[model samples]
Target chain A: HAGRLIEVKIPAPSLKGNLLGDPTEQSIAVYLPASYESAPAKRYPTLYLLHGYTGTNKTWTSPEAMNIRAMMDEMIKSGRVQEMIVVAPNGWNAYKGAFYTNSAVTGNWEDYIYRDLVQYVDANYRTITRAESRGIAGHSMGGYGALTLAMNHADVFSAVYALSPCCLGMEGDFTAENSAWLKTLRLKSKEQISARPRSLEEFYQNAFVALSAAFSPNLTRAPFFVDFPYQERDGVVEKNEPAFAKWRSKMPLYMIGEKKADILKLRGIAIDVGEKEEFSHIRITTGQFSKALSEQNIPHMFEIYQGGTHNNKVRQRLETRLLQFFSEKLDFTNP
Target chain B: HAGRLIEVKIPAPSLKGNLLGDPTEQSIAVYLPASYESAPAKRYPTLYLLHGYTGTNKTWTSPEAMNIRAMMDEMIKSGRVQEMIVVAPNGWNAYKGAFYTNSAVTGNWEDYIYRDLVQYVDANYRTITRAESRGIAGHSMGGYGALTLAMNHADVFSAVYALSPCCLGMEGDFTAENSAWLKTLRLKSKEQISARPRSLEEFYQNAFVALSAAFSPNLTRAPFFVDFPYQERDGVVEKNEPAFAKWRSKMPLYMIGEKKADILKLRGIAIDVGEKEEFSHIRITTGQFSKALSEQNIPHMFEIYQGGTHNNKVRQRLETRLLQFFSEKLDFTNPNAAALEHHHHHH
Candidate 1:
């Protein structure tokens, strides 16, 4: 028995008129489990799945790797995990892609995801409106969004699973990586693609520019209006502390630390990174996040998966590890 | 009693006709252990001491914190370390300080220090000039110089001791630190203090400017004749890789990997930093170097002193730790023969 995959074009009122000129109508990919059509009266638990940096809603269903629908279908067939609805909404912006952050620069992604998308899904589909019946998960950029957004609005999501997340605190030198990428983004803005173009070369810079616009948008500055974390001084590099502070404000570690009691409201929180992660800094940053949680005595599952890289082989865990965790965490009973 | 501190001012042929118009006549401070005057016929092992950025030869003797001269006297008298001659040379360039690299932008510091100063010491003093009889030790920028220079010129220095070594590789987010310091350096070029001006703020920028002068000097450029590691791109920051490569090329981690066989010829190597170092990047860089050495199975001592910092409370190591390591490594026997038989490596 296979789950029903639905394509809903959500008209986001929150993102109607925004800078960067992104589309007002965005496509959302939602997966209805096998029991959805057969038992129409019964409501089910829902998990909002987010994609990595430079990814769209289609990323979950795309053959890129760890196709979420196939993984969910296999998990439900095995009877190892309970069936649940998985929602993936298009979070793409003009400058690369959104980091799932809200701003006038990148449009109000928070309102779109929470108010517009969540309400539309509940009204149209068989979704349990209670917070305990809702969960959130994403890979890379989506993982970061899940952690940060969930911490702020515990009423929206009860659980989260982060896979090889980016945009955390404490990083290694990305100068060589950023330098090469910035050269391309600045020079070839017109020739760039709009869809899932994972070149991997200057993607880091694209994410940086997009993140800056989302978190620290400068409306007055025209053409990619953002205040970067750094500036040149006396032929040397200097950090713009104010710009960096704006970025820090959005980091999950900092956000979670401040809202420990409210964050502890979640039934479950789990974060995982590959042992042989491509970005070594992610492991370090993720380790720091786990450490922050540990110091605060917050209960959460943190896994360093052996024999795993960023996007390779780790998606196997989606069926084996992720779905099972969500099944146990998200409340299925309608009590 | 007291050891003799000799001040020698020599006209440097290596540094003559430099663009910076810095003094061709450089000053040197040589510390002769009390044993030097009594044993006129006998010679002793020598250690070359380099100071941190914005410092002169007098830094070793200056009563800033833990005086190197006083510490050496106490160690020798107590038999903690054997009697040895310590030579300190002025390495200040026109900028904050040169990173001990040869450049038209900052004069030929390498030739001046290794050729002119080494020859002067061997000629004037009862000293051992053989690689086996010599050692190099410095703090901060000086430590970086000791680590890199010794690796390149294993023929010159046999042993090395670096304390809280700065300007190595594998760093953290020092942009704010760098930015804050660069602003001050650009604003106040002349009004800065003479020596040992320790402000945690803006110090990172001062060091960067000095290192740029030494490693990536651009004579074709003006105001500050150096290439920065980063530039503004589309109102965003972008790293200048070519310029960065120049700085990294001189870094110890990269140089050691390049010249592993030459560096292994070193009799002994010791590097240490404060556990609570102000420059957090220095410890990370030092760890990488230590890890690199370990990978090659090189024989060296590395330590993270408890409650230590960049320059704070480290002078005690000069007496208790550093001098003893040199005494055990530097061969003092037949020392007189080394000075007389050694030939100069002319620039």
Candidate 2:
């Protein structure tokens, strides 16, 4: 099961030229066994995988990496799947994280992944380009991104697998305890910031960035404002409205109320969560979403892994499914 | 109230001359009644009232504007109070509204009203020198400004009346059902103003302006790397942390945690709500605030007037309390203080 690793760097069309709106890209990496050189022209199925927070393309190739190669080999030997090219890329940008949304604050991760990365992979690599030939997957925040693309752009990818996807419900309030300090910190005025207590920048540490990230998300404010809708009196926080709007936007499983053409096109949408992962909470959410799909008769495969918290279960799940799904459905055209 | 209005312009002061920061005397306006005939040596007790939202000094002299002269005279002659001069001025900037808060974006309304405006009034008009001689008050969002001035600069004003204040509360879930959109409107993103659904310039509309004028105020954010903070998600209303912090800076009742020095230095701090006004809800709010004050042992006068709803009550409530407050406290040592001397404009 021990397989060699190789990093492939492919250039993407500049965002200014390629997709009209998307030119942002770094090289995409693909792993090849040492034996693959022996059969140079042999084509392979492709799985475009993405990284979660704080990861770069090295997420897959590092010694501490989850050894996805070994897992794939073992799974294939057991007749669970087939050989394929796994393309992994970093999601982090100027900051250590971007929730993978197309934004002015963050680079266009949305276009970079779905458009630049996939198109570059399809154009440069020897693999199938049709739906049956490709699959998209990710973990944690990346998992959510993976699912959103499949659901929103079924024309690009046919299969989907995700792990401990955050922002699933995309709806959570700061705990009551945190709210109290937020209230207290909120009471501290600019003058106070100017007078004693702390610097305005420091006070912001307690409220502005803290509360904004914890409460209102930057992506949710559609009109270009950078702060949440907050009501304050004296130095006390009375209410925050925009912060709540951001919560509602995070819940993707909620009836998206988008176009149907995009929804029904997915050849397969496989949802997975660790047994212990809070992500399983999506079952209730997914149930509501799936029921809506059933009403429309849209089919999908939803699975709950035997054991996995937000962290531990990714390699096993990916190894088992990546091969199985590709062997059965990957259409190796002209291979 | 049918008095014709006239305008006087001033220079835009630079950082060199005024702690008022970048002063703009040229950008300023001072209104005079057409009937003024230079009453020689006649002094008046001045009421330095700042504007809320889109108001200017001229708004007060409008036909619908409260005839402060008439009201003061009516109250004073009726034995309820005394005669006084009232000076209302424009507090908003080109952003359409300054929010009266100090912001890198909106500039600083507090400094403008307190330093620039006060200095101008002193140099131009015959008024009192000491803080005890001047009165401070505003309606709606201005109500917040008045409270803020009294709280932050206690020695500048003797009395303050706040009408309907907004920026308050711990955040609850953001939903369309909630007025999250109201706060989103406060998004001070100027570079992307056109791309945004809400206009930062027009954020102060109807009651939301009243909410923000007193609450979430700031002049800046990230991304474009400006000075103010407005919480947004891909242009959507996410959290209003930045604006809240900006506005909270001026709050005296809640977030800013008004000091004992300021509230105590104030000889009169008046809070009132109309019975039928949506602000009537303010009773519970002011009550909660009063309780806090009581606990702090800060003295104030809180009232809930009968009959009027919101806008309808500002005139009557102001006229009575103002005349009496002035009779007891108006400083006649300075020229601006002469603004309160005689009241004949309205009737």
Candidate 3:
């Protein structure tokens, strides 16, 4: 028998007053083990799952994106992975994704996940509340957020697994000379982006605008409420050094030095990325991230799977590697 | 004959749209060598001097603080130091001092110095235009600015000297539970500060507000466009982590990792602090900065002098240590020969 998928709405107090006008009530999908109803007064370890950019909690339950309930049942029935409660929350904002970082504009997404979501999961469900019993994993943008939240608040999560994480470092295409960057600078209002049908260039522009809203938010700048890393004057594009520096500080690569001690305290860390990622920065930065960790002598598991794309192998890896890693790292004994 | 001190007004295009409402016209004090008028064809090296907190360019010229003109004449007449032009620009703003950082609120003070001020000096004076002949030095807040600007834009200034530099690292008084911090949080408007007579606590509050404006600016926050490092709720104070992180990235000590390559290219670097500093963080952070540099195998001269306060030994150090170091480090020969070769040697 397969585990049941229960949908619940969680109130996020941390997301109140967010400038994006995103809803405070979040939809979450929870997967309960088949034996969950049979066993009384028994609590299981929890693993929080995050979705990529433009993905909702329904992404985990949809057959097209992933069927996490079936995967969990097969792994648990075969004894390949330990029984645990899985949670997937909607991280959708007006920009399509929050990047899982705190901002006045995007709302305090980091606090929402670590504080509001965790508290709701523990209080409402039969789950272990200790850090050793908690783990986090995600895909693409979700993958980036998983590692970031793990590193920033190690006291809340014991282990983290990232699947083809994005934004580990600055992308090469963010340069002022690039066409997409130039097009993004010409954007005047949020309405202008959605006013017409989306194009390939429009997607790139929207992605950068989303990133700017999360990183270099400027309340004085209206319409979008963000400061682009480059400014245009007299038909010339010049680097906004301060705004660029603000973006760098938010990237996981640059945060290593400041958050080294907190990162060292994490019980387990694992990362996997496809060699043929749609975005080249993901492949390049994931390798660079492993090298940086090696330079600091921080232990972790890293894999570059052969002949894989960003989303094609995500479900297969979730059943095999992601669950296997957490089974060994997360505490399973109930008190 | 002593050097002639000329007061000039420079228009700063870089500081035009500053949120602080500070004027774009800046006052600067320039000192010409005794033989400057007679030797019209000769070009000389330049040393930029910065003043401490609450000090204007006039601080360097005032007899009560420092008589830079008299000291320059004595040093050059005695042949202890070479004849060089000295420039001291006013860094005063509504907050009494600009800390010499680039901020959307305080304006881009860094660009004001390296681009605007430097261009005006080179265009209007008989000064060497190469980095090899340029040096910067300052005391207290100016001292901190000197090192920061030198490290960030090594191509502009070849050498640097700092005296009892302030705000190298986070200070202990910034803690959330501290009474001064708590009082600062109680402030609702900028007018509340100057509305009453200034007290010692008020000084601390204003200083922190000035720092917040420079580092962690939030435009939506009205009255003061700054985000304080701590927030209070129901009389309970908690650290504002993001705002605190913004302030850390601006500190000179924390910036070392990012600016290491630029710092290694500088010709000279020297820092001095008193053992008995009035604000203990200055002494502590100075030693820590030296240790951090040593860990990276970067060479620099650091001195902890015998007995001195912040302003007590400013004039003495400028005459003895500041000028002596710059004389040996800055290129003095009328160049077009050694300058080109020296520039190529760095690579």
Candidate 4:
């Protein structure tokens, strides 16, 4: 038997009045297991997969990317995991991806995922509806979202798995001297960004802009309503301390000190990063994040596997580690 | 007029019977002010200057590193800083330097500096023999020594300054996969380390070896008598957990929580690092160290300046900030004399 993938749209009131002008109607990709249609009266556990930056709702389903439907079907067929409903919501915005955080510029992605998205999935799908049955997982920016969201809203997501999460803390390269940020400063309007084709260099610039939009949103600023952590002035790069403070407030590393209670409430917390990650900051910050968690005596699984880059082993990890974890932790039986 | 530079050797009971086979006699460099011989029975405050790794007592006086005597002469002549007695001790050992930490393999450098070195300086030199009269400062490895020693023994050194200190905490590069560490793992004995001419790459390996020697000494192991944080087996490298734990126990960043009380008793505390340090770990860890101090509401001066490296600005910083800090904080006059005078007047 084979699983089925269905596309649905959910209205997001939280995304209204967002400066990015992104749609209030969010497209969600839902995966129903082979038994989902067969046992019509039975409710099943659910998993919400948050995609990384530059990813759409169709990213997991896309052949070029994860092709997650095939992986999920194989896992259920091999009896490696329990059959559950999986939901992937669109976090794409003016800045490629929202980093899955609440922002006036990028829209309240936190509210959209936790409140509107959860409510919609439970009402429309045959979900268990209880906290124990729900889990959240993601990769890269999506990984960051899965972590921060699960930490803040443990009652909503009982289990969380983050794969090579990005932007965990302020890294050494977060200086104003970074060429990408310098280029970002040169841009006068959002039209200029949209006018040019996206290059790797441009992606670097846009990623920082997206981070600033989500973390340090400035509603009064023109074009892109965001405040950069660092600014260049008269051939000198200086830290904008006030703007940096706002960014730190959103970082998972800094947020851990305050969110200890919520983190402890999580049933299962797992984070993994490839040692050979191209962006050194992701590995360093993920290590620091795990260290911070350990200092607080909060139980969690942290692994740094060798011979893997950022996106190379996502499929294997999902089948072996991610799905297996949720199956073991998430409550599959309806009480 | 120039100040006098004198070299003296003191017995170090603490370092005797050490595994490194280094000598127990510590050579000390003492700087007496220009007016010391002219003014009979004149005593001044003392500042203990600890040298960095691979540096001897003569490192400060060497024209290549820091011509401290000339700088001191100018500062005293200009009346910018009060005349003070400065002492620089030899911390060089089997691994090029001891890192000035207590270790079974490296020798008890902590005891040698705070106890034997301080006692010998006070007894033999014209110095104000009191806690407030003493200040300690160093650069790079010496900087780490200065901060950790001052934190643990504030009563011995009232003021402290660290210039581009090293080994603050573990960094991303402290992995077994690093080429320098990987080469270090292949070495079998101390004889093999000495057999090769030192290259830049070799310095990287030796530095980690020295750090491990100071932080994670293993007298029972081998000729080198140290534990590597990570070990290689069958072409694969893995962390030696028990050994890594020993190294963490000595790092200054990890020691802050326990040493908070001692750190608070200090008259002055200052630390600075170059923004463009060659090793990224120094800058990153120094920032974290300062942040940790700030989180505990501890008062200290932390600066990150541009256009500087590990050792480039050491001379300028010593002349401007280091001496200036001591002039304001150290007790120059003898408190015992005032107490005696008051006793006679009361009688």
The TM-score ranking, best first, is 4, 3, 1, 2
Query: What lDDT does candidate 4 reach at residue B168?
Result: 81
Tell me what fraction of the real C-alpha contacts between chains A and B each candidate also makes: 0.00, 0.00, 0.00, 0.00
Model 1 chain B: weakest 10-residue lDDT segment is: B185-194
Candidate 1 Cα deviation (angstroms), residue A184 = 58
For model 1, the superposed segments whose C-alpha errors exceed 4 Å read A1-335, B173-178, B181-201, B335-347
- Candidate 3 C-alpha lDDT tens digits along B172-199: 5545535778888888887876533366
**Candidate 3: clashing pairs of residues:** none
- Candidate 1 recovers what fraction of true contacts? 0.00
Candidate 1, residue B217: how far the Cα is off, in Å: 1.0
Per-candidate DockQ values are: 0.01, 0.00, 0.01, 0.01
Local distance difference test, each candidate: 0.75, 0.56, 0.84, 0.82
User: What DockQ class does candidate 4 belong to?
Assistant: incorrect
lDDT of 4 by residue, B177-244 (tens): 36777788888767665634367567777777888888888889875778888888886878889888
Sort the predicted structures by lDDT, highest score first.
Answer: 3, 4, 1, 2
Per TM-score, the best of the predicted structures is: 4
Q: Candidate 2 — which residues are off by over 4 angstroms?
A: A1-4, A8-27, A33-35, A57-59, A77-79, A172-225, A228-251, A279-288, B1-347
lDDT of 2 by residue, A276-304 (tens): 66533444454455555667666766676
Residue by residue across A1-335, what tens digits does model 4's lDDT show?
69988887889988999987799998999999998778889899999999988888677888677877887888899887899999999998888889989998888999999999999999999999888999999998999999999988999999999998988887744555456777887778876667334686777777888898999999988668888888888957677789889988888999988998888788888887774677766867776776576555465656555446888887777876689889988998998
Classified by CAPRI criteria, candidate 1 counts as incorrect
